[PDB]
C-alpha cells in the first residue's frame, strides 16, 4: 500500500511527461508541413529557431521520461519483492 502509492504517483507523472512530448512533437510536425508548403509554392530564419526551440523541449522531456521510467521499474521490482 505504501509502495503502491509511490508507484502510482510515478506512473501518473510519466503519463504527463509522454503527453507533453506528444504535444511538443505535434508543433514540430506543423513546422515540417509549413516548410513543405513553402517549397511547394516555388516549384524562414525564424523557422530554424522554432525547430531548435521545440527540440530542446522534447529532449528535455525524453531525458526526464527516461529517468522516471527507471524509477518506476525499480519500485515495481521492490513491490514484487515485498509481495512474495
Amino acid at each position, epitope marked *: 500500500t505504501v509502495q503502491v502509492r509511490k508507484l502510482l504517483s510515478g506512473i501518473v507523472q510519466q503519463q504527463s511527461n509522454l503527453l507533453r512530448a506528444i504535444e511538443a512533437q505535434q508543433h514540430l510536425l506543423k513546422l515540417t508541413v509549413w516548410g513543405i508548403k513553402q517549397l511547394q509554392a516555388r516549384v524562414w530564419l525564424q523557422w530554424d529557431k522554432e525547430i531548435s526551440n521545440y527540440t*530542446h523541449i522534447i529532449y528535455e522531456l525524453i*531525458e*526526464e521520461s*527516461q529517468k522516471q521510467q*527507471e524509477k518506476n521499474e525499480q519500485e515495481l*521490482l521492490e513491490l514484487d519483492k515485498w509481495a512474495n
Partner: antibody
Amino acid sequence: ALQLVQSGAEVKKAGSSVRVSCKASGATFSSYSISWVRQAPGQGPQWMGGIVPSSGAAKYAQQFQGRLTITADTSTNTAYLELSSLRYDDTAVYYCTRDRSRVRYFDRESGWFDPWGQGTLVTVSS
Amino acid sequence: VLTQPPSVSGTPGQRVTISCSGSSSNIGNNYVYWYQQLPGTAPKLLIYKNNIRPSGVPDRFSGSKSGTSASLAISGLRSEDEADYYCAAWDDSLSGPYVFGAGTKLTVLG
C-alpha cells in the same frame, strides 16, 4: 535513477589480464548500451568499446580490436572489461557509461553518455 | 583529434568561451557533446546534442556550433566552475567512433 558503481582498482605487470566490473544500482540497463572509455592521467578521454546487454552486440575501437573483450551479464546487471597483452601506455582511469539512445544503439548519430561510473585506477608498472 | 585550447581564464562574473576545432567528418556533420570534469570526479555531461542541456545544469552554460568548429559559452563564472572541459563528437573516419578533445582548464583566477 540509474547509477554506476565500479570496483577493482589494481596494479598489473606488462602482459597481464585485468578484469574491471561496472555494476548498476537504482535501475536496470535493459534497453540501453553501456560503453567503456579510458582517460590517461593528464591526457583526455578515449573511447574503448561498447556492448548491448539485451542483444549481445559488441563494438571495438581499431586500437584495441583483438586484445579487448567486453561482456555484460543481465541476470546480475554487471558489465565487465577485460584486457589481454597489457602494455605500459595502458595506465589510465577506466570509466563505464551508457548511451541514452535506445533505438539503433551504435553509430546512429548518437553518443549521449549521461550516468558515468566512479572510475577505477588501472596501473601498468612492473 | 578534436583541437582544444590549453587554458582560458576569467574573473568572477565574466563570460568564457571554449573553442573546439574539428574536421568535416566529425563536427561538420554530427552532434557535439560537452563534459565537465571536477578534479577527482567522473566527467559529467554538460551539453548534449548541439546546445541541448541536461537536468541540473544551470542556464548560464550554453553550447554553440557553426561549421566544423564548436564553442562552449560559460556566462557568470563561479568558484564551482573551475574544472576540465572536453568536447566530443561521433566520427565517420577510420580512426574510430566517438572522438574526444584534449581538454581545456578553466580558472576562476583569484
